[PDB]
């Protein structure tokens, strides 16, 4: 009853995807699916409709690394080191890697449930920063966000109208810097 643990291997700067591909391909090559459970590359999908990048954006939990459900053995070890573009086994001493803890797996998977559940636009806003308005009704004016909302997403923002400052309910789509 060989329980395949979870290990992590260093990928390269901009190679992670094709690395995971080639990994599964070499698994199929040696038919060692029993030894290699799943190659996990967690990611994130931050969604903004305008502001350059539009309607989506793809982040990752952490670059340069790939997560595998391998089982520990020298054969599997070289099977992962006989791949195009990886570094050694991220962990303890080389040729004797350190499987990541189960708590790590559980926490990361809770992270994945959270991120995949709600498409959460990052580059968020903080109550107290000043910001302009690129929208028709208040073109190029500038006030301070007095409250940030996410579901309603309507930027309670104090701005100067008729002398007295007053809140305004303009949406994210028209905010300036910050």
């Amino acid at each position: 009853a060989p329980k395949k643990r979870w290990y992590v291997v260093q990928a390269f700067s901009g190679f992670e995807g094709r690395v995971a591909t080639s990994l599964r391909e070499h698994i199929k090559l040696h038919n060692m699916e029993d030894l290699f459970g799943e190659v996990m590359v967690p990611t994130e999908e931050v969604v903004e409709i305008r502001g350059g990048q539009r309607r989506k954006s793809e982040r990752k939990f952490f670059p340069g690394y790939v997560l595998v459900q391998m089982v520990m053995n020298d054969a599997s070890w070289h099977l992962v080191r006989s791949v195009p573009r990886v570094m050694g086994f991220i962990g303890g001493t080389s040729d004797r890697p350190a499987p990541i803890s189960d708590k790590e797996v559980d926490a990361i998977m809770n992270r994945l449930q959270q991120v995949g559940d709600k498409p959460r636009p990052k580059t968020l806003f903080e109550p107290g920063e000043m910001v302009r308005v690129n929208d028709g009704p208040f073109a190029d004016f500038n006030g301070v966000v007095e409250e940030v909302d996410y579901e309603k997403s309507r930027l309670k923002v104090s701005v100067s109208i008729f002398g007295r400052a007053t809140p305004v309910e303009l949406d994210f789509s028209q905010v300036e810097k910050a």
């Binding site: 903080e126 109550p127 107290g128 920063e129 000043m130 966000v145 007095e146 910050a178």
Partner: protein, 267 residues
């Protein structure tokens, strides 16, 4: 741009300073209400505190706040703390002496992040934010250029609430007066620290300070090129209420000068 929390804090400080100034011209309404050994807490302090807290709650109903009066009002997000002194040097206010300031600092994860002090009388606004520096109404603050003890002006506060160390303090005072140029005694540790940030005093030291008074100045002098320390170079000051600060060389000279006279109680 600008730092957000800094902005909301400076709004709070503006409102509080305006309230204090408005009440400063009716000494028949603000009475002397003592709390401990000559630490008055007048009703105006309570009003300014309430105003500041209200203004904050609009933008952070979740941040835990600290205040000498209301102790520690917990918040649903207690990773960030708001330390306040609505009034510094209550005695200087009750005597209607026009030299005092309100101090608001925001710590994140324990490390102080932003600080502001506001003197309404002279209308001076010392702001400071880590990673951007310190400003006095738009001027950068690089403290005093002193590099010795001669010609140096030393601001200080006296342990007039912990008078047991008086002799000790006075002892060191004498020692200091053998090397420095002149002293300053204003009565508001926040404003003294601020002056250190503005170079208007070549350094500063004090014994017996509450943790909610230097929190608005220590970051000020830090981002003002100066440094702080305990009376021995450590960092237990946040608990001992014993501060010594100034530009680095002057701090070194002062520490090497004081280490001998120091009563081992403070060590």
């Amino acid at each position: 741009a600008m730092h957000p929390m800094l902005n909301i804090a400076v709004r709070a400080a503006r409102k509080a300073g305006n309230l204090i100034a408005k009440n400063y011209e009716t000494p028949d309404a603000v009475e002397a209400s003592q709390k401990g050994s000559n630490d008055f807490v007048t009703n105006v302090d309570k009003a300014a505190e309430a105003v500041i807290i209200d203004t904050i709650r609009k933008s952070y109903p979740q941040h835990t706040i600290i205040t000498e009066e209301s102790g520690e009002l917990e918040g649903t997000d207690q990773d960030v703390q708001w330390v306040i002194d609505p009034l510094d040097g209550t005695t200087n206010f009750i005597k209607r002496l026009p030299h005092f300031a309100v101090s608001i600092a925001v710590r994140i994860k324990g490390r102080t992040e932003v600080a502001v002090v506001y003197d309404p009388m002279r209308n001076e606004l010392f702001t400071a934010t880590r990673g951007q520096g310190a400003q006095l109404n738009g001027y950068r603050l690089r403290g005093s250029t002193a590099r010795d003890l001669d010609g140096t002006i030393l601001a200080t506060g006296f342990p007039f609430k912990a008078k047991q160390y008086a002799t000790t303090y006075i002892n060191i005072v004498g020692k200091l007066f053998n090397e420095c140029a002149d002293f300053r005694r204003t009565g508001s540790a926040a404003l003294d620290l601020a002056y250190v940030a503005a170079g208007r005093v070549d350094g500063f030291f004090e014994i017996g300070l509450r943790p909610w008074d230097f929190a608005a100045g220590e970051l000020l002098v830090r981002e003002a090129g100066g440094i702080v320390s305990d009376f021995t170079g450590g960092h237990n000051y946040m608990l001992t209420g014993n501060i010594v600060a100034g530009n680095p060389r002057v701090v070194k000279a002062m520490l090497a000068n004081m280490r001998d006279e120091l009563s081992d109680a403070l060590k």
